[PDB]
Amino acid sequence: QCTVQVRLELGHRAQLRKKPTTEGFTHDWMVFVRGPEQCDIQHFVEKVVFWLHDSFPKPRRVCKEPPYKVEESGYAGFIMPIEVHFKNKEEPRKVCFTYDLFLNLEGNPPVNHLRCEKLTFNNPTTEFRYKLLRAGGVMV
Numbered sequence: 512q513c514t515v516q517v518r519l520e521l522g523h524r525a526q527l528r529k530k531p532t533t534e535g536f537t538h539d540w541m542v543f544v545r546g547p548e549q550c551d552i553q554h555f556v557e558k559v560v561f562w563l564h565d566s567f568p569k570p571r572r573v574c575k576e577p578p579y580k581v582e583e584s585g586y587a588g589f590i591m592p593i594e595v596h597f598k599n600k601e602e603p604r605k606v607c608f609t610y611d612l613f614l615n616l617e618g619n620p621p622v623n624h625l626r627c628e629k630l631t632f633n634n635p636t637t638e639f640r641y642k643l644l645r646a647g648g649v650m651v
């Protein structure tokens with residue numbers, strides 16, 4: 512008879528290189544999933560899958576432990592599905608976000624963006640509830 516809320520932060524950075532790569536990639540970028548200060552999402556997160564554009568090599572990028580991030584070089588923004596899988600035996604087993612990985616046009620400052628996500632678990636099992644609480648989760 513309980514609800515537990517946990518917080519995730521998804522974000523990215525992007526900057527124009529001083530000089531493009533030999534391939535002609537103009538930008539360095541980094542996407543991540545993290546917890547707020549002090550929290551450890553690794554208690555309830557099995558893994559984070561970042562689905563890169565098909566143009567990237569091995570575009571299914573998996574992080575089973577922190578940091579949950581991908582560092583890349585490229586020349587264009589794209590919509591990146593990001594799946595956060597839970598150490599959970601029942602539904603929901605994962606959440607999927609549609610992440611807008613946008614780059615800065617020439618002249619514009621570097622990108623430093625954050626998206627705060629609140630997950631509400633209705634009546635988690637006892638076992639999963641231990642994992643959510645150990646991560647810094649809160650009973651509503």
Ligand SMILES: O=C(NC1CCCC1)c1cn(-c2cccc(O)c2)cn1
Nearest residue numbers: 564566567568584585586587588589
């Ligand atoms: O920016 C790239 N591709 C855009 C086209 C439409 C949105 C995404 C990109 C980067 N790469 C690459 C290749 C080789 C090593 C590497 O690190 C990156 C391939 N493609």
